[PDB]
Design a protein around this ligand. Sequence first.
Ligand SMILES: Nc1ncnc2c1ncn2[C@@H]1O[C@H](CSCCCCNCc2cccc(-c3ccc(Cl)cc3)c2)[C@@H](O)[C@H]1O
Ligand SMILES: [K+]
Ligand SMILES: [Zn+2]
Length: 256
Amino acid sequence: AHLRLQPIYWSRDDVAQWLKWAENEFSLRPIDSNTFEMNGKALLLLTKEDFRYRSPHSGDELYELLQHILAQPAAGDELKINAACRKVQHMVVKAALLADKFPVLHDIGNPKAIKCVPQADVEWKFYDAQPCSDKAYKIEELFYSYATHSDKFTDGVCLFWNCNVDRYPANSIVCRFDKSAFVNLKQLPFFYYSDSPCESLKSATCITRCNLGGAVCRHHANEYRLYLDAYNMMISAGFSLWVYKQFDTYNLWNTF
Ligand SMILES: Nc1ncnc2c1ncn2[C@@H]1O[C@H](CSCCCCNCc2cccc(-c3ccc(Cl)cc3)c2)[C@@H](O)[C@H]1O
Ligand SMILES: [K+]
Ligand SMILES: [Zn+2]
């Protein structure tokens, strides 16, 4: 299932599993798993000749295989994408509320009145153009247009998780499925934030207590890697994340 990502997201282990899969799918002479000691990003840099030299018995086959994979990327499993999207949503909105301590959250495009951070100290308010009739009693029926509402919802923060509107207001958190709509915002770079306790990896994007000293505990390490797999699955599927321009990860480091 890892291979259902674009090869540019493949790890060293993924490339090796790719070999094993192809050896059985195409009945190839078996190649050593370390025939391509590299990740998919490096794999996309090699020439077909490098394939022939690294595997004289099946290198050309594998190259054209990689090319057929790039020419027709595999469709994603909807349940794994829902879960990925839900995981990133909770991560990101939780961090923003902790960084900037917004008093109100305006959730625009949420027909089910479900909080993605139920434990947060904030007033949560829901809006949707077509609310679920079983949740409309606590949802404002509203079609957001920047032209009509740019003067409203100016307190706290607005959340547009896959609610594609004409233009997002400046105090927004946005997920968008595939640039004039995003002028008030900036791209959200990757980060992982956790305040769960440490229990017994190097990267500047693992915002955890154990990484203040650079010695991330085994637990947050595993949780970081799970979160990066979910994030990659979402980005690889065509989502992008946008945020209010004052978003600052150093505010999250200050929570420790
Ligand atoms: N202009 C609008 N103003 C207000 N509401 C407006 C406006 N346009 C549209 N809507 C409403 O948004 C909504 C249009 S997506 C309806 C699903 C809920 C969106 N978020 C909740 C959520 C949570 C987790 C995952 C996902 C998710 C991830 C990937 C993909 Cl592929 C699809 C969904 C979504 C409907 O409720 C529309 O009636
Ligand atoms: K606003
Ligand atoms: Zn830790």
